[PDB]
Amino acid sequence: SPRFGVNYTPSNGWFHHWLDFDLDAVRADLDSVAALGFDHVRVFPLWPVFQPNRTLIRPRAVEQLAALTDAAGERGLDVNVDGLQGHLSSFDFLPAWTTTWHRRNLFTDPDVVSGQAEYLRTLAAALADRPNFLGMTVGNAINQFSGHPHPDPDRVTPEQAGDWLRRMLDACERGAPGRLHLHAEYDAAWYLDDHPFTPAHSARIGAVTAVHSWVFNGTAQRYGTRSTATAQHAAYLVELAKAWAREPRRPVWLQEVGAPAPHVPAEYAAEFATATIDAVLDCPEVWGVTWWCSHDVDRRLADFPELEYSLGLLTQDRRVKPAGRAVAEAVRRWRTETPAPRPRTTALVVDVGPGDQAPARSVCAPGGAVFEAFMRLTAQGARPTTVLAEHATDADHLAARGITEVVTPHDVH
Amino acid sequence: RSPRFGVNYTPSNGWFHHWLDFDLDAVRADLDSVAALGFDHVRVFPLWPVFQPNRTLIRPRAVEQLAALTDAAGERGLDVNVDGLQGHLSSFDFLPAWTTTWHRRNLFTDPDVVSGQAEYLRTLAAALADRPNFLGMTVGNAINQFSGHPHPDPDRVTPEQAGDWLRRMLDACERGAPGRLHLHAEYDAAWYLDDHPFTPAHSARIGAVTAVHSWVFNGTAQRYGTRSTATAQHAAYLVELAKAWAREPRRPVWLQEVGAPAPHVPAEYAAEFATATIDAVLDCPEVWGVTWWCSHDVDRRLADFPELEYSLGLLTQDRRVKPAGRAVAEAVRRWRTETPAPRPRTTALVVDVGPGDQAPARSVCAPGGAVFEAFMRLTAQGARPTTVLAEHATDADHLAARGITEVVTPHDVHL
Ligand SMILES: CC(=O)N[C@@H]1[C@@H](O)[C@H](O[C@@H]2O[C@H](CO)[C@@H](O)[C@H](O)[C@@H]2O)[C@@H](CO)O[C@H]1O
Ligand SMILES: CC(=O)N[C@@H]1[C@@H](O)[C@H](O[C@@H]2O[C@H](CO)[C@@H](O)[C@H](O)[C@@H]2O)[C@@H](CO)O[C@H]1O
C-alpha cells in the first residue's frame, strides 16, 4: 500500500534544464529511475522560469512539464508536481516581480497571491487529462521563506499562512478536481516554536500530511550517525504528524528522505537507507516513501553545499550507487512481501502548548523531551505513536485510533 | 566622427523574457521596423540570470541566440552594443539565485561573484568578436542603481571599489573582444546624487566613451514643466556636463538613453519633445550617437510595470510607427541629408562639485541645483554653454585644447 518513488533531479542541467529542455535526456533519466522499481516521481518546475511576469505563465513551459509527465507515464511512473520553487537545495528562485523594487510578501500580498493561484491552477488544469498525474504539492518547503533562519524572510502569522494554504489548494482543486493536492513544509513546522507554518496546517490542510526527514537537522549531530534516533527519525516524523490529524487514518507521505554526508557518510548510505525505510514501514498508513534524490547534482554547477552533490541514488551519469542498489530491494521486498504493520497502541503524550499554534513545539525537536521519550520507547520495542495532550484522555479520539495505553515523556523518564 | 542614431531594443513579443521563447523571425520583424526608420545601431539586453543561471554555467544556447540576434541586426545595417549585467531593467531587478539570500554576495566586491561576472562578459564579447557589426560591450544597464540609496536593498561599495570593479569588468570585455568599444553606463545618480559610489570621474575616465541616460522624470519636468527649456535641453545638458570630467578633450559622449515618459511628457507632446530634444543634442559636438528608449511599446498584458514604461516605444506592439517614431525618423533623415557641421562651444560654465575625485557636492548639478539652473539660463540666452571643472577654470592649456575662451560661474550667470 505504501508507494515508492524519487524526487527527480535532472542529471543534465539540474533544475535549470527548463532553459534547455531535452526530452531524450529526461527519458533516459526516467528509464534509470524506473529500472530501480519506483512507481512515481516528484518533479519541480522553476517558478520564475514558468511565470517570469505576474501575468505571463509561459505555455511552452507548461507543454514541457506535460511532456515530462507523459514520458514518466510511458515508463510506469506517476507524477506529483511541486508548484512554487521557490527553494531548492540552498538556492532561492524568486521572480523579479516579488523582490526589491517589487518586494511583496509571498504569503500576503493580494496580487502575488492571485498570481500564484493562477500559476498553480494552470499547471494542474494542464495535467488534469493525464492518467498518471497524481496532483500538486503547493511548493517545496515554501515555509522556509516565512521566518528564521531565512536571512530575509516574508514573515507571516499562522492565521495568514493557513489562509494562504487554503487559497493555494483551492486553485489546485479548481485546476484538477478530485486529484491528490497537498502542501509540504520542512521540519521547522514541527520543531520551531515561532514558526508560522504549524503541525495543524500540515495535518489538517491538504489531502495527506507530507513530511521531509533530514537527519542533519540536529539529530545525527546530537545522537550520532549510527544511533537509534538517526535511523528512526523518519518513522518519528510520521508518527508525530498523526497527533494533529482529525481523521484517524489520514495518510502520511514521507515525501523526502535522504542520506546526507557527512552526517550519513557515503559508505554508510546504503545501510542507513535500508534501516530508515524498514523503520518507517512499521508505521501504519504511510502513503509512500520518496527518496531525495534520483541523480547526483553535476559538480560542474558551483556553490551547492557539498552535501547536495551526493544525495542521488544514481550518479550524474546514471550509474546505480550503493544506496540506489539498496533501495532497489527495500522496495521489491517492501512491496508485495511486507505486511501492513500492526496498529501502534501505545501513544506518547505531546504537549505543545494550548491552541492550534504549537508555541512549545520545540519539545519535539532533537534534544527535546518528546523526541527523546519517543526514541526511548522505540528502543524498548514499544512501537509508539503520539497523541496531543488535549486528547490524552479523549476516549473517542483514542478508540478511533486503537490506542489502548497513553504515557507522558515524564512516565518514560 | 559624425553622430550615430539607434534604439534600445525592447522585443515586442515577450519583452526581455523573449530569451525564454526565442523567436528569430519575431526578432527579424522587430528589426525590420527599426531599420525602416533609418537607424544604424541597436542596444540589446541579455537577462543575466537566464544567461548565467549558476555561477559556473554560462548557457551556450543563450550565447548562440545573442549571436543570432546580432546577425539579424547586421543584415539590416544595425550595429550592436550588448549590455551585459541586467541586473536592472524598467523597475525590475533580475538577480541570479547564486547572488541572493542564502548566497547573498556583494555584486561589486565578492571574489567569486566578480570572477563569475568577468567570465560572463568575456564570454559574450568573445562569442561576438567575429561579427563586423558588433560594436562592443556595455558593462550593464545602470548597474550603479544596486550600489546605494534609493535602492531598497543595496550592495554598498566605496567609490574606490566601484572604480576597481569597473576596470576589472572592462578588462574582461577587452580580453574577449580586443579593440572594440567597451564602456559602462550609469544612471544619473552618478552626476546628481551626493555620496553615490559611482562618480562623474568613473563615467568620463573609465571605458571608451561616456554614456549618459537622459530621463526628465528625474525632477526636471516636475520642477520646470513639461514644455520648459530645461525639459527640452536636459539631454544636451548631460552631454555637456559629462565633458567636464574627461581627460581627453574630444572624448565622445554617447546619449545612450533618451525617451519621452508620460505624463512628464504627455503622449500628445512626445513627437514635439523628441524633435526638440534631438535638435538640442545635435547642437553639441562630439556626440557619439543618440539611442532612443525604446524601439517597441511593452505589452500591457505584462503586469506591474510603472505606467510610463509601456508606451516608451517609437513603434507599437504590432510594429506600427508612433508619432514620436515619425519625429525621430525625420530628425535622422534631416541630419543624414544636410550633415550639418559641428559647432564648437567656446563658453564654459564652471562646475564645482567639491574637492577630490568623489564629487561630494554634485547635487548642484541636479534639477534645482545652481549649476543646472545656470546652464539652462545660458542655454535659453543662446550662449550654447559647455562645462568646465573648477580645478580647470584657469587652466589655459585645458581651455585651449577645448577651444574655450569664456569661463563663467553660476553666480556670474545669477547676475
Ligand atoms: C538553505 C538550505 O540549504 N536549506 C535546507 C533545504 O534546502 C532542505 O530542503 C530539502 O533538503 C534537500 C537536502 O538538503 C534539498 O536539496 C532540497 O531543498 C529539499 O527540498 C531542508 C530539509 O529539511 O533543510 C534546509 O536546511
Ligand atoms: C526602479 C526604477 O524604476 N528605476 C528607474 C530605472 O528603471 C531607469 O532606467 C532607465 O529608464 C527607462 C525608463 O524608466 C527604463 O525602462 C530602463 O530601466 C532604463 O535603463 C532610470 C533612468 O534614469 O530611472 C530609475 O528611477
mmCIF file with all atom_site columns, N, CA, C and O in Angstrom, chain A residues 16 19-20 53-55 58 60 87 90-92 96 100-102 104 144 149 151 300 302-303, chain B residues 20-21 53-56 59 61 91-93 97 101-103 105 145 150-151 301-304:
data_model
loop_
_atom_site.group_PDB
_atom_site.id
_atom_site.type_symbol
_atom_site.label_atom_id
_atom_site.label_alt_id
_atom_site.label_comp_id
_atom_site.label_asym_id
_atom_site.label_entity_id
_atom_site.label_seq_id
_atom_site.pdbx_PDB_ins_code
_atom_site.Cartn_x
_atom_site.Cartn_y
_atom_site.Cartn_z
_atom_site.occupancy
_atom_site.B_iso_or_equiv
_atom_site.pdbx_formal_charge
_atom_site.auth_seq_id
_atom_site.auth_comp_id
_atom_site.auth_asym_id
_atom_site.auth_atom_id
_atom_site.pdbx_PDB_model_num
ATOM 1   N N  . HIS A 1 16  ? 17.843 23.775 -13.847 1.00 0.00 ? 16  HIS A N  1
ATOM 2   C CA . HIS A 1 16  ? 17.956 24.711 -14.962 1.00 0.00 ? 16  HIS A CA 1
ATOM 3   C C  . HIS A 1 16  ? 17.649 24.059 -16.305 1.00 0.00 ? 16  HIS A C  1
ATOM 4   O O  . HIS A 1 16  ? 17.695 24.754 -17.329 1.00 0.00 ? 16  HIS A O  1
ATOM 5   N N  . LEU A 1 19  ? 15.454 25.575 -19.105 1.00 0.00 ? 19  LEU A N  1
ATOM 6   C CA . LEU A 1 19  ? 16.000 26.524 -20.074 1.00 0.00 ? 19  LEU A CA 1
ATOM 7   C C  . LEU A 1 19  ? 16.619 25.847 -21.285 1.00 0.00 ? 19  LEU A C  1
ATOM 8   O O  . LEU A 1 19  ? 16.933 26.528 -22.265 1.00 0.00 ? 19  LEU A O  1
ATOM 9   N N  . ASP A 1 20  ? 16.830 24.534 -21.233 1.00 0.00 ? 20  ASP A N  1
ATOM 10  C CA . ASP A 1 20  ? 17.417 23.776 -22.329 1.00 0.00 ? 20  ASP A CA 1
ATOM 11  C C  . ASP A 1 20  ? 16.744 22.406 -22.330 1.00 0.00 ? 20  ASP A C  1
ATOM 12  O O  . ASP A 1 20  ? 17.378 21.366 -22.177 1.00 0.00 ? 20  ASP A O  1
ATOM 13  N N  . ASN A 1 53  ? 6.709  36.930 -15.379 1.00 0.00 ? 53  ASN A N  1
ATOM 14  C CA . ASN A 1 53  ? 5.955  38.127 -15.053 1.00 0.00 ? 53  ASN A CA 1
ATOM 15  C C  . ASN A 1 53  ? 4.667  37.648 -14.395 1.00 0.00 ? 53  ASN A C  1
ATOM 16  O O  . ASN A 1 53  ? 4.215  36.536 -14.669 1.00 0.00 ? 53  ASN A O  1
ATOM 17  N N  . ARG A 1 54  ? 4.101  38.459 -13.491 1.00 0.00 ? 54  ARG A N  1
ATOM 18  C CA . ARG A 1 54  ? 2.913  38.018 -12.764 1.00 0.00 ? 54  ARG A CA 1
ATOM 19  C C  . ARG A 1 54  ? 1.803  37.553 -13.702 1.00 0.00 ? 54  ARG A C  1
ATOM 20  O O  . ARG A 1 54  ? 1.084  36.601 -13.382 1.00 0.00 ? 54  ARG A O  1
ATOM 21  N N  . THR A 1 55  ? 1.663  38.168 -14.877 1.00 0.00 ? 55  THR A N  1
ATOM 22  C CA . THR A 1 55  ? 0.612  37.753 -15.802 1.00 0.00 ? 55  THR A CA 1
ATOM 23  C C  . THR A 1 55  ? 1.199  37.204 -17.101 1.00 0.00 ? 55  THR A C  1
ATOM 24  O O  . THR A 1 55  ? 0.664  37.406 -18.193 1.00 0.00 ? 55  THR A O  1
ATOM 25  N N  . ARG A 1 58  ? 4.147  30.889 -19.001 1.00 0.00 ? 58  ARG A N  1
ATOM 26  C CA . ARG A 1 58  ? 4.612  30.542 -20.343 1.00 0.00 ? 58  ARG A CA 1
ATOM 27  C C  . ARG A 1 58  ? 4.009  29.224 -20.817 1.00 0.00 ? 58  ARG A C  1
ATOM 28  O O  . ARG A 1 58  ? 4.268  28.176 -20.202 1.00 0.00 ? 58  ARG A O  1
ATOM 29  N N  . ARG A 1 60  ? 4.862  27.317 -23.272 1.00 0.00 ? 60  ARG A N  1
ATOM 30  C CA . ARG A 1 60  ? 5.883  26.337 -23.632 1.00 0.00 ? 60  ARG A CA 1
ATOM 31  C C  . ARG A 1 60  ? 6.398  25.605 -22.402 1.00 0.00 ? 60  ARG A C  1
ATOM 32  O O  . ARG A 1 60  ? 6.673  24.401 -22.459 1.00 0.00 ? 60  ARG A O  1
ATOM 33  N N  . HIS A 1 87  ? 12.319 27.423 -3.166  1.00 0.00 ? 87  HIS A N  1
ATOM 34  C CA . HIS A 1 87  ? 13.592 26.979 -2.618  1.00 0.00 ? 87  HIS A CA 1
ATOM 35  C C  . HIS A 1 87  ? 13.960 25.586 -3.115  1.00 0.00 ? 87  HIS A C  1
ATOM 36  O O  . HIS A 1 87  ? 13.169 24.644 -2.985  1.00 0.00 ? 87  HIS A O  1
ATOM 37  N N  . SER A 1 90  ? 19.410 24.900 -1.293  1.00 0.00 ? 90  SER A N  1
ATOM 38  C CA . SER A 1 90  ? 20.097 26.077 -0.750  1.00 0.00 ? 90  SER A CA 1
ATOM 39  C C  . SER A 1 90  ? 19.868 27.333 -1.575  1.00 0.00 ? 90  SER A C  1
ATOM 40  O O  . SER A 1 90  ? 20.232 28.410 -1.119  1.00 0.00 ? 90  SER A O  1
ATOM 41  N N  . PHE A 1 91  ? 19.290 27.227 -2.770  1.00 0.00 ? 91  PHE A N  1
ATOM 42  C CA . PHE A 1 91  ? 19.059 28.371 -3.645  1.00 0.00 ? 91  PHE A CA 1
ATOM 43  C C  . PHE A 1 91  ? 17.591 28.777 -3.620  1.00 0.00 ? 91  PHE A C  1
ATOM 44  O O  . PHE A 1 91  ? 16.695 27.924 -3.641  1.00 0.00 ? 91  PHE A O  1
ATOM 45  N N  . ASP A 1 92  ? 17.347 30.087 -3.587  1.00 0.00 ? 92  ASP A N  1
ATOM 46  C CA . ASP A 1 92  ? 16.000 30.635 -3.681  1.00 0.00 ? 92  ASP A CA 1
ATOM 47  C C  . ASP A 1 92  ? 15.796 31.113 -5.112  1.00 0.00 ? 92  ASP A C  1
ATOM 48  O O  . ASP A 1 92  ? 16.592 31.915 -5.609  1.00 0.00 ? 92  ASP A O  1
ATOM 49  N N  . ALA A 1 96  ? 11.370 38.170 -10.348 1.00 0.00 ? 96  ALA A N  1
ATOM 50  C CA . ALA A 1 96  ? 11.755 39.566 -10.174 1.00 0.00 ? 96  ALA A CA 1
ATOM 51  C C  . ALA A 1 96  ? 10.577 40.420 -9.723  1.00 0.00 ? 96  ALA A C  1
ATOM 52  O O  . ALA A 1 96  ? 10.777 41.438 -9.051  1.00 0.00 ? 96  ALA A O  1
ATOM 53  N N  . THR A 1 100 ? 12.979 43.214 -4.294  1.00 0.00 ? 100 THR A N  1
ATOM 54  C CA . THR A 1 100 ? 13.491 44.593 -4.251  1.00 0.00 ? 100 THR A CA 1
ATOM 55  C C  . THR A 1 100 ? 12.434 45.652 -4.587  1.00 0.00 ? 100 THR A C  1
ATOM 56  O O  . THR A 1 100 ? 11.526 45.884 -3.775  1.00 0.00 ? 100 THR A O  1
ATOM 57  N N  . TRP A 1 101 ? 12.555 46.336 -5.735  1.00 0.00 ? 101 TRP A N  1
ATOM 58  C CA . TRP A 1 101 ? 11.580 47.371 -6.092  1.00 0.00 ? 101 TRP A CA 1
ATOM 59  C C  . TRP A 1 101 ? 10.147 46.843 -6.086  1.00 0.00 ? 101 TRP A C  1
ATOM 60  O O  . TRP A 1 101 ? 9.200  47.625 -5.920  1.00 0.00 ? 101 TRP A O  1
ATOM 61  N N  . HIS A 1 102 ? 9.975  45.536 -6.273  1.00 0.00 ? 102 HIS A N  1
ATOM 62  C CA . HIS A 1 102 ? 8.676  44.881 -6.289  1.00 0.00 ? 102 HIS A CA 1
ATOM 63  C C  . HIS A 1 102 ? 8.500  43.946 -5.102  1.00 0.00 ? 102 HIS A C  1
ATOM 64  O O  . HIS A 1 102 ? 7.690  43.015 -5.171  1.00 0.00 ? 102 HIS A O  1
ATOM 65  N N  . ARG A 1 104 ? 7.162  42.085 -2.338  1.00 0.00 ? 104 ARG A N  1
ATOM 66  C CA . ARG A 1 104 ? 5.770  41.890 -1.974  1.00 0.00 ? 104 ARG A CA 1
ATOM 67  C C  . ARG A 1 104 ? 5.663  40.511 -1.354  1.00 0.00 ? 104 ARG A C  1
ATOM 68  O O  . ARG A 1 104 ? 6.041  39.513 -1.979  1.00 0.00 ? 104 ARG A O  1
ATOM 69  N N  . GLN A 1 144 ? 10.067 27.742 4.296   1.00 0.00 ? 144 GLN A N  1
ATOM 70  C CA . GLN A 1 144 ? 11.384 28.273 4.637   1.00 0.00 ? 144 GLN A CA 1
ATOM 71  C C  . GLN A 1 144 ? 11.523 29.767 4.319   1.00 0.00 ? 144 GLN A C  1
ATOM 72  O O  . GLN A 1 144 ? 12.486 30.397 4.769   1.00 0.00 ? 144 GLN A O  1
ATOM 73  N N  . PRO A 1 149 ? 15.487 30.446 10.130  1.00 0.00 ? 149 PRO A N  1
ATOM 74  C CA . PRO A 1 149 ? 16.715 31.209 9.896   1.00 0.00 ? 149 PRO A CA 1
ATOM 75  C C  . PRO A 1 149 ? 16.899 31.828 8.521   1.00 0.00 ? 149 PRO A C  1
ATOM 76  O O  . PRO A 1 149 ? 18.033 32.176 8.197   1.00 0.00 ? 149 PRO A O  1
ATOM 77  N N  . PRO A 1 151 ? 17.580 34.434 5.799   1.00 0.00 ? 151 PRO A N  1
ATOM 78  C CA . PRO A 1 151 ? 18.252 35.729 6.002   1.00 0.00 ? 151 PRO A CA 1
ATOM 79  C C  . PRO A 1 151 ? 17.373 36.938 5.743   1.00 0.00 ? 151 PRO A C  1
ATOM 80  O O  . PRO A 1 151 ? 17.731 38.045 6.173   1.00 0.00 ? 151 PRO A O  1
ATOM 81  N N  . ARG A 1 300 ? 29.859 20.308 -12.022 1.00 0.00 ? 300 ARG A N  1
ATOM 82  C CA . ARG A 1 300 ? 30.138 21.454 -12.885 1.00 0.00 ? 300 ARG A CA 1
ATOM 83  C C  . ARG A 1 300 ? 29.260 22.657 -12.548 1.00 0.00 ? 300 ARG A C  1
ATOM 84  O O  . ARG A 1 300 ? 29.499 23.749 -13.076 1.00 0.00 ? 300 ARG A O  1
ATOM 85  N N  . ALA A 1 302 ? 28.418 25.165 -9.600  1.00 0.00 ? 302 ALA A N  1
ATOM 86  C CA . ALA A 1 302 ? 29.129 25.585 -8.402  1.00 0.00 ? 302 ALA A CA 1
ATOM 87  C C  . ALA A 1 302 ? 28.187 26.067 -7.293  1.00 0.00 ? 302 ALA A C  1
ATOM 88  O O  . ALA A 1 302 ? 27.011 26.362 -7.516  1.00 0.00 ? 302 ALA A O  1
ATOM 89  N N  . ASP A 1 303 ? 28.741 26.109 -6.074  1.00 0.00 ? 303 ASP A N  1
ATOM 90  C CA . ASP A 1 303 ? 28.254 26.816 -4.889  1.00 0.00 ? 303 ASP A CA 1
ATOM 91  C C  . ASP A 1 303 ? 27.196 26.038 -4.108  1.00 0.00 ? 303 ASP A C  1
ATOM 92  O O  . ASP A 1 303 ? 26.714 26.553 -3.080  1.00 0.00 ? 303 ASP A O  1
ATOM 93  N N  . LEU B 2 20  ? 13.506 33.293 -23.163 1.00 0.00 ? 20  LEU B N  1
ATOM 94  C CA . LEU B 2 20  ? 12.888 32.035 -22.762 1.00 0.00 ? 20  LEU B CA 1
ATOM 95  C C  . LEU B 2 20  ? 12.046 31.408 -23.860 1.00 0.00 ? 20  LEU B C  1
ATOM 96  O O  . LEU B 2 20  ? 11.674 30.233 -23.739 1.00 0.00 ? 20  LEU B O  1
ATOM 97  N N  . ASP B 2 21  ? 11.728 32.158 -24.911 1.00 0.00 ? 21  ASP B N  1
ATOM 98  C CA . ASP B 2 21  ? 10.889 31.710 -26.015 1.00 0.00 ? 21  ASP B CA 1
ATOM 99  C C  . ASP B 2 21  ? 11.441 32.371 -27.271 1.00 0.00 ? 21  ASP B C  1
ATOM 100 O O  . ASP B 2 21  ? 10.767 33.161 -27.954 1.00 0.00 ? 21  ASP B O  1
ATOM 101 N N  . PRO B 2 53  ? 22.685 31.015 -15.132 1.00 0.00 ? 53  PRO B N  1
ATOM 102 C CA . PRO B 2 53  ? 21.788 30.614 -14.030 1.00 0.00 ? 53  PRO B CA 1
ATOM 103 C C  . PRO B 2 53  ? 22.519 30.040 -12.839 1.00 0.00 ? 53  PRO B C  1
ATOM 104 O O  . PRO B 2 53  ? 21.928 29.962 -11.754 1.00 0.00 ? 53  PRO B O  1
ATOM 105 N N  . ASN B 2 54  ? 23.746 29.586 -13.040 1.00 0.00 ? 54  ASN B N  1
ATOM 106 C CA . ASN B 2 54  ? 24.653 29.142 -11.995 1.00 0.00 ? 54  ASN B CA 1
ATOM 107 C C  . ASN B 2 54  ? 25.982 29.828 -12.256 1.00 0.00 ? 54  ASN B C  1
ATOM 108 O O  . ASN B 2 54  ? 26.326 30.090 -13.405 1.00 0.00 ? 54  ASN B O  1
ATOM 109 N N  . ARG B 2 55  ? 26.726 30.147 -11.194 1.00 0.00 ? 55  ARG B N  1
ATOM 110 C CA . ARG B 2 55  ? 27.954 30.920 -11.384 1.00 0.00 ? 55  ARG B CA 1
ATOM 111 C C  . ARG B 2 55  ? 28.881 30.287 -12.413 1.00 0.00 ? 55  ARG B C  1
ATOM 112 O O  . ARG B 2 55  ? 29.595 30.996 -13.135 1.00 0.00 ? 55  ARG B O  1
ATOM 113 N N  . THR B 2 56  ? 28.885 28.963 -12.511 1.00 0.00 ? 56  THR B N  1
ATOM 114 C CA . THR B 2 56  ? 29.776 28.300 -13.450 1.00 0.00 ? 56  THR B CA 1
ATOM 115 C C  . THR B 2 56  ? 29.023 27.608 -14.581 1.00 0.00 ? 56  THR B C  1
ATOM 116 O O  . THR B 2 56  ? 29.516 26.646 -15.175 1.00 0.00 ? 56  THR B O  1
ATOM 117 N N  . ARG B 2 59  ? 25.164 29.596 -20.334 1.00 0.00 ? 59  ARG B N  1
ATOM 118 C CA . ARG B 2 59  ? 24.460 28.692 -21.220 1.00 0.00 ? 59  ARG B CA 1
ATOM 119 C C  . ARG B 2 59  ? 24.891 28.898 -22.666 1.00 0.00 ? 59  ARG B C  1
ATOM 120 O O  . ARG B 2 59  ? 24.696 29.998 -23.214 1.00 0.00 ? 59  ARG B O  1
ATOM 121 N N  . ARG B 2 61  ? 23.430 27.996 -25.339 1.00 0.00 ? 61  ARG B N  1
ATOM 122 C CA . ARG B 2 61  ? 22.299 28.334 -26.203 1.00 0.00 ? 61  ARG B CA 1
ATOM 123 C C  . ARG B 2 61  ? 21.956 29.816 -26.123 1.00 0.00 ? 61  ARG B C  1
ATOM 124 O O  . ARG B 2 61  ? 21.559 30.425 -27.125 1.00 0.00 ? 61  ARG B O  1
ATOM 125 N N  . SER B 2 91  ? 12.384 48.916 -13.877 1.00 0.00 ? 91  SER B N  1
ATOM 126 C CA . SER B 2 91  ? 11.912 48.826 -12.485 1.00 0.00 ? 91  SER B CA 1
ATOM 127 C C  . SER B 2 91  ? 12.106 47.442 -11.880 1.00 0.00 ? 91  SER B C  1
ATOM 128 O O  . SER B 2 91  ? 11.940 47.294 -10.668 1.00 0.00 ? 91  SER B O  1
ATOM 129 N N  . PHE B 2 92  ? 12.452 46.435 -12.675 1.00 0.00 ? 92  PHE B N  1
ATOM 130 C CA . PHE B 2 92  ? 12.704 45.076 -12.199 1.00 0.00 ? 92  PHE B CA 1
ATOM 131 C C  . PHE B 2 92  ? 14.197 44.788 -12.059 1.00 0.00 ? 92  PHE B C  1
ATOM 132 O O  . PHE B 2 92  ? 14.994 45.098 -12.954 1.00 0.00 ? 92  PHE B O  1
ATOM 133 N N  . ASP B 2 93  ? 14.559 44.134 -10.955 1.00 0.00 ? 93  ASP B N  1
ATOM 134 C CA . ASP B 2 93  ? 15.903 43.605 -10.745 1.00 0.00 ? 93  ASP B CA 1
ATOM 135 C C  . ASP B 2 93  ? 15.910 42.120 -11.080 1.00 0.00 ? 93  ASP B C  1
ATOM 136 O O  . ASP B 2 93  ? 15.165 41.338 -10.469 1.00 0.00 ? 93  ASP B O  1
ATOM 137 N N  . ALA B 2 97  ? 20.101 33.501 -8.644  1.00 0.00 ? 97  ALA B N  1
ATOM 138 C CA . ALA B 2 97  ? 19.867 32.899 -7.336  1.00 0.00 ? 97  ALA B CA 1
ATOM 139 C C  . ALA B 2 97  ? 21.160 32.751 -6.551  1.00 0.00 ? 97  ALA B C  1
ATOM 140 O O  . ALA B 2 97  ? 21.138 32.764 -5.314  1.00 0.00 ? 97  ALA B O  1
ATOM 141 N N  . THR B 2 101 ? 19.924 35.976 -1.044  1.00 0.00 ? 101 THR B N  1
ATOM 142 C CA . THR B 2 101 ? 19.513 35.340 0.217   1.00 0.00 ? 101 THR B CA 1
ATOM 143 C C  . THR B 2 101 ? 20.571 34.397 0.779   1.00 0.00 ? 101 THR B C  1
ATOM 144 O O  . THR B 2 101 ? 21.578 34.865 1.317   1.00 0.00 ? 101 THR B O  1
ATOM 145 N N  . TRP B 2 102 ? 20.354 33.079 0.696   1.00 0.00 ? 102 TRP B N  1
ATOM 146 C CA . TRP B 2 102 ? 21.324 32.146 1.271   1.00 0.00 ? 102 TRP B CA 1
ATOM 147 C C  . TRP B 2 102 ? 22.707 32.287 0.645   1.00 0.00 ? 102 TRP B C  1
ATOM 148 O O  . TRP B 2 102 ? 23.706 31.897 1.267   1.00 0.00 ? 102 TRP B O  1
ATOM 149 N N  . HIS B 2 103 ? 22.776 32.807 -0.581  1.00 0.00 ? 103 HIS B N  1
ATOM 150 C CA . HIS B 2 103 ? 24.016 33.038 -1.296  1.00 0.00 ? 103 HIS B CA 1
ATOM 151 C C  . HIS B 2 103 ? 24.306 34.524 -1.473  1.00 0.00 ? 103 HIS B C  1
ATOM 152 O O  . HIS B 2 103 ? 25.037 34.899 -2.391  1.00 0.00 ? 103 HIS B O  1
ATOM 153 N N  . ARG B 2 105 ? 25.891 37.711 -1.918  1.00 0.00 ? 105 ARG B N  1
ATOM 154 C CA . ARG B 2 105 ? 27.299 38.044 -2.092  1.00 0.00 ? 105 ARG B CA 1
ATOM 155 C C  . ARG B 2 105 ? 27.363 39.323 -2.906  1.00 0.00 ? 105 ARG B C  1
ATOM 156 O O  . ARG B 2 105 ? 26.765 39.395 -3.982  1.00 0.00 ? 105 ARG B O  1
ATOM 157 N N  . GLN B 2 145 ? 22.671 51.421 -9.928  1.00 0.00 ? 145 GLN B N  1
ATOM 158 C CA . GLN B 2 145 ? 21.468 51.522 -9.105  1.00 0.00 ? 145 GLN B CA 1
ATOM 159 C C  . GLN B 2 145 ? 21.420 50.467 -8.002  1.00 0.00 ? 145 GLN B C  1
ATOM 160 O O  . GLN B 2 145 ? 20.606 50.602 -7.088  1.00 0.00 ? 145 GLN B O  1
ATOM 161 N N  . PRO B 2 150 ? 18.546 55.286 -3.754  1.00 0.00 ? 150 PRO B N  1
ATOM 162 C CA . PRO B 2 150 ? 17.352 54.812 -3.043  1.00 0.00 ? 150 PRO B CA 1
ATOM 163 C C  . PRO B 2 150 ? 17.009 53.317 -3.204  1.00 0.00 ? 150 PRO B C  1
ATOM 164 O O  . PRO B 2 150 ? 15.875 52.945 -2.869  1.00 0.00 ? 150 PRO B O  1
ATOM 165 N N  . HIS B 2 151 ? 17.942 52.486 -3.678  1.00 0.00 ? 151 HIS B N  1
ATOM 166 C CA . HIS B 2 151 ? 17.653 51.062 -3.782  1.00 0.00 ? 151 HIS B CA 1
ATOM 167 C C  . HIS B 2 151 ? 17.217 50.514 -2.421  1.00 0.00 ? 151 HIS B C  1
ATOM 168 O O  . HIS B 2 151 ? 17.791 50.879 -1.389  1.00 0.00 ? 151 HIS B O  1
ATOM 169 N N  . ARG B 2 301 ? -0.343 43.352 -21.444 1.00 0.00 ? 301 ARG B N  1
ATOM 170 C CA . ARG B 2 301 ? -0.638 42.078 -20.800 1.00 0.00 ? 301 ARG B CA 1
ATOM 171 C C  . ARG B 2 301 ? 0.437  41.656 -19.806 1.00 0.00 ? 301 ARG B C  1
ATOM 172 O O  . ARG B 2 301 ? 0.257  40.640 -19.127 1.00 0.00 ? 301 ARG B O  1
ATOM 173 N N  . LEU B 2 302 ? 1.553  42.377 -19.733 1.00 0.00 ? 302 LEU B N  1
ATOM 174 C CA . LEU B 2 302 ? 2.579  42.143 -18.723 1.00 0.00 ? 302 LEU B CA 1
ATOM 175 C C  . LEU B 2 302 ? 2.304  43.086 -17.557 1.00 0.00 ? 302 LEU B C  1
ATOM 176 O O  . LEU B 2 302 ? 2.071  44.281 -17.763 1.00 0.00 ? 302 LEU B O  1
ATOM 177 N N  . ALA B 2 303 ? 2.291  42.551 -16.342 1.00 0.00 ? 303 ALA B N  1
ATOM 178 C CA . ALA B 2 303 ? 1.829  43.335 -15.209 1.00 0.00 ? 303 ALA B CA 1
ATOM 179 C C  . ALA B 2 303 ? 2.986  44.022 -14.488 1.00 0.00 ? 303 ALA B C  1
ATOM 180 O O  . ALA B 2 303 ? 4.154  43.659 -14.642 1.00 0.00 ? 303 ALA B O  1
ATOM 181 N N  . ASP B 2 304 ? 2.629  45.028 -13.695 1.00 0.00 ? 304 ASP B N  1
ATOM 182 C CA . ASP B 2 304 ? 3.401  45.627 -12.611 1.00 0.00 ? 304 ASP B CA 1
ATOM 183 C C  . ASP B 2 304 ? 4.466  46.616 -13.067 1.00 0.00 ? 304 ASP B C  1
ATOM 184 O O  . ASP B 2 304 ? 5.161  47.169 -12.197 1.00 0.00 ? 304 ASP B O  1
#
